Amino acid sequence: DNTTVFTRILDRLLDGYDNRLRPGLGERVTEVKTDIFVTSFGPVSDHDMEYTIDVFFRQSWKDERLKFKGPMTVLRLNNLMASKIWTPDTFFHNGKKSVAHNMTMPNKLLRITEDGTLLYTMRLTVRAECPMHLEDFPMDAHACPLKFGSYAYTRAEVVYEWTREPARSVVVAEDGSRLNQYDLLGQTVDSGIVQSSTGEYVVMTTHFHLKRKIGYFVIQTYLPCIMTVILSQVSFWLNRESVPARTVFGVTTVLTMTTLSISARNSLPKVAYATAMDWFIAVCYAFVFSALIEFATVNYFFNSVSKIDRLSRIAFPLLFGIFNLVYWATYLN
């Protein structure tokens, strides 16, 4: 007899309520105020051109059929009330497979302020699509987007807006930084109108500025390719008469160079254009191949030392240093 007062209020709101109609269907345009709390920015798969994000997708609108007078103002209600009322059909434009978490109860809440203001948050993991242009691999930077808007309601019915200021309407938690390869720099939001065959919809887009950390590929591709060149350029310091010895240098360095040429592109997609790493590999391929034809030159020609070996001892280490000085200068800036 002390909790039946709140039982009367909840049945009073849903009596005569039609949840198939947006509020102000014949009067106004339903403004949906939205803000995103990112609990953990998950990993970026650069093979699928996708990324995973865990959000607290908050929404807010005003319904004039849910006014009430009671003891308390905020009604921190349960989850199953939300399916009994009107909710906007917000979907992600570039989502691929997003999951609403259901353990143990569904991870949604619903607060009904006594003037008719609703707050409807949910916990979603979103596997959105991030189109990439890997022409500066691995020193590239990306702007991974996240576009969302209504599905069945046009811009004359449902419009979207941010709750707080657009600078601080997408908040990233400090502890959630599940990127292991990329590095999150900042977030930028925007809003516009899209055009479709059915009509004009309001779309909300939040870009994620990412920058790849080079340090994995230094100790995986760059340093072993550099040390292969030094392994290939030690052949100029031997004698001219070590034909089986120098041909081990001339074959095993170029045989191990094409293995790293294959194995550096396995995690990459099958893109048509050549990446910036492949230009470093091909010049390093060209430096270890010109060392092999250097030995084939001196083998064709009391045996004194050669002018070819006395010049390639100085030129080939120097000319690799000129390339390495200009490659890291023009792709790190």
């Epitope: 200021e165 600078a167 939001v189 809003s191």
Partner: antibody, heavy 117, light 106 residues
Framework: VQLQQSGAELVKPGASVKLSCTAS????????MYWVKQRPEQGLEWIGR????????KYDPKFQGKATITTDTFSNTAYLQLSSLTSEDTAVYYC???????????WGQGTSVTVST | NIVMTQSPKSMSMSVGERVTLSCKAS??????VSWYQQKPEQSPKLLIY???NRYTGVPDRFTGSGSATDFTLTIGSVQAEDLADYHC????????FGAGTKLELK
């Protein structure tokens, strides 16, 4: 719809002044309240903002500790509070609300303060 | 903080030709850039909310252009009722304003 402000006043330097912005046709709890400083022959200057749902307040870094805003939902009016006013701040104060795309669609008529002898 | 630079300070053209206002931001503001006019000794009104999105009531000769940094306000034909200075505000952060841009008629 219609935004109303009180009339102009004459104050001495170093005193305190109260200025009001009455809103009609719409409640304050769902839209922000913006106040902006308009000097003569000069551009605008935003000074602060109000979220009346929770009483949140954020000021301009220049006007920190200079102005204070209280808001009454029942009176449908927001209030200025200029504690330490000097003779340099002789201008007109305008009232505003948040528009469709965070613009300021509806503006008050403006109240001019005059700090002189 | 965000600063908005409105160029030029003033101009003077006759009735019924092309005028191009300018407003450039310090850093990235996406679309939330507002245009306000100020008729002398009245209240400001709103011309374009957002970038390139006309408000209701103003004529169709007013138009805008949006980008990441630079924003242009264009009137196809200057009329006799446009004696005001135009202010360029922003709303991606806490709002700031430019210095305005006066105009005069012969």
């Amino acid at each position: 719809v219609q935004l109303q402000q009180s009339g102009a006043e004459l104050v001495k330097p170093g005193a305190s002044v109260k200025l009001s912005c009455t809103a009609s046709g719409f409640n304050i709890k769902d839209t922000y309240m913006y106040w902006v400083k308009q000097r003569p022959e000069q551009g605008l200057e935003w000074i602060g903002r109000i979220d009346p749902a929770n009483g949140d307040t954020k000021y301009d870094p220049k006007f920190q500790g200079k102005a204070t805003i209280t808001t009454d939902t029942f009176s449908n009016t927001a209030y200025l509070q200029l504690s330490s006013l000097t003779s340099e701040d002789t201008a007109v104060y305008y009232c505003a609300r948040k528009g469709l795309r965070w613009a300021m669609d509806y503006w008050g008529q403006g109240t001019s303060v005059t700090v002189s002898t | 903080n965000i600063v908005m630079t409105q160029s030029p300070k003033s101009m003077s053209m006759s009735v019924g030709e092309r005028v191009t206002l300018s407003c450039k931001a310090s850093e990235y503001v996406g679309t939330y850039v507002s245009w306000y006019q100020q008729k002398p000794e009245q209240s400001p009104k709103l011309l374009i909310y957002g970038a390139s999105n006309r408000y209701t009531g103003v004529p169709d000769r007013f138009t805008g252009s949006g980008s990441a940094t630079d924003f242009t306000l264009t009137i196809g034909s200057v009329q006799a009722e446009d004696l005001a200075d135009y202010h360029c505000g922003q709303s991606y952060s806490y709002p700031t304003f430019g210095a305005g841009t006066k105009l005069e008629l012969k």
